[PDB]
Amino acid sequence: TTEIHPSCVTRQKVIGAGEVYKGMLKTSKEVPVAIKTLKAGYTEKQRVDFLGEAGIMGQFSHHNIIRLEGVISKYKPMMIITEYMENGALDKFLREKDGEFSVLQLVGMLRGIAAGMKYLANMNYVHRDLAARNILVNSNLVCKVSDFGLSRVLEDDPEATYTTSGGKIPIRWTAPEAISYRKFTSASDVWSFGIVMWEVMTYGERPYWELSNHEVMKAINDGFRLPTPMDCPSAIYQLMMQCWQQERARRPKFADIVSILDKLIRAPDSLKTLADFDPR
Numbered sequence: 001t002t003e004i005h006p007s008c009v010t011r012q013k014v015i016g017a018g019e020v021y022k023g024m025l026k027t028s029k030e031v032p033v034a035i036k037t038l039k040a041g042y043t044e045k046q047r048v049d050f051l052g053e054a055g056i057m058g059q060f061s062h063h064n065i066i067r068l069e070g071v072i073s074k075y076k077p078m079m080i081i082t083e084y085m086e087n088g089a090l091d092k093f094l095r096e097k098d099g100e101f102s103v104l105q106l107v108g109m110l111r112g113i114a115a116g117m118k119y120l121a122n123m124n125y126v127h128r129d130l131a132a133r134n135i136l137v138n139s140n141l142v143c144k145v146s147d148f149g150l151s152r153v154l155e156d157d158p159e160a161t162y163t164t165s166g167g168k169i170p171i172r173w174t175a176p177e178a179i180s181y182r183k184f185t186s187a188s189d190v191w192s193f194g195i196v197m198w199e200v201m202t203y204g205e206r207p208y209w210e211l212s213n214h215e216v217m218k219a220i221n222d223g224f225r226l227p228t229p230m231d232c233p234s235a236i237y238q239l240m241m242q243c244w245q246q247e248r249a250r251r252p253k254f255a256d257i258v259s260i261l262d263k264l265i266r267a268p269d270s271l272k273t274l275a276d277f278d279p280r
């Protein structure tokens with residue numbers, strides 16, 4: 001990757017925990033960035049993984065994948081530096097802006113997420129935690145796939161007889177074959193994308209809000225699926241459903257998804273919903 005020198009970085013406003021700062025980065029002028037820093041006390045596990053995340057991020061270069069500016073690996077604090085995404089996480093953003101977007105604008109956000117996942121699928125990179133809480137949004141509504149790593153935070157005692165293996169999965173976002181057999185593929189990512197479509201079209205509602213984790217797992221294997229979002233065009237809900245086919249080989253590929261949405265976008269009568277009608 002690109003090694004940044006501490007001299008070119010300046011932290012400013014703390015904005016989260018993983019800490020994650022807002023700061024500035026000099027190039028020769030300066031730009032705003034997000035700075036992920038390791039806890040002020042760490043282990044070979046918590047440090048070797050911190051660096052290992054950034055080696056993965058550096059492989060990605062796409063308009064819809066969070067862009068790694070560089071890393072600071074030879075000083076304290078160590079830093080993983082990315083572009084700054086002003087509007088934060090998609091799911092919180094959509095609840096904030098509940099109702100303020102047209103169907104065209106929401107489907108444009110899904111097109112961008114799909115385009116990032118298509119790029120990852122062609123790298124043979126499986127995400128495993130594709131959800132709105134892992135999509136960042138910039139001031140131009142461009143959505144970029146990210147991973148905050150909450151699946152890999154473990155609460156095991158350091159002397160426990162039994163420990164978590166293989167991280168944790170987001171039950172409500174994970175395809176059945178992945179839950180049951182740990183068969184993680186881009187096809188299980190497509191399932192998760194279907195859930196993300198539902199998140200966007202409901203402005204961040206909680207999937208299967210009425211049900212417990214075990215009741216979701218039962219519902220899914222009994223053949224039920226999330227219901228239509230309000231004001232959702234027929235074609236969009238039809239597309240989620242195809243993402244949630246029980247046999248993974250029958251689901252669309254991310255390439256088919258990007259293409260299906262492009263066609264709806266360029267024939268926007270297919271995206272008409274009465275709530276977008278203005279009598280004026």
Ligand SMILES: COc1cc(NC(=O)c2ccc(C)c(Nc3nc(-c4cccnc4)nc4c3cnn4C)c2)cc(OC)c1
Nearest residue numbers: 016017018020034035036053056080082084085146147148
């Ligand atoms: C192996 O796993 C992978 C790891 C990654 N890593 C990241 O996506 C990652 C790492 C480092 C940084 C600095 C950011 N940047 C942000 N993160 C947060 C944030 C806030 C609170 C808690 N956690 C995160 N807020 C941000 C930004 C930018 N703007 N804002 C408002 C993202 C990506 C992978 O696939 C592409 C795969």
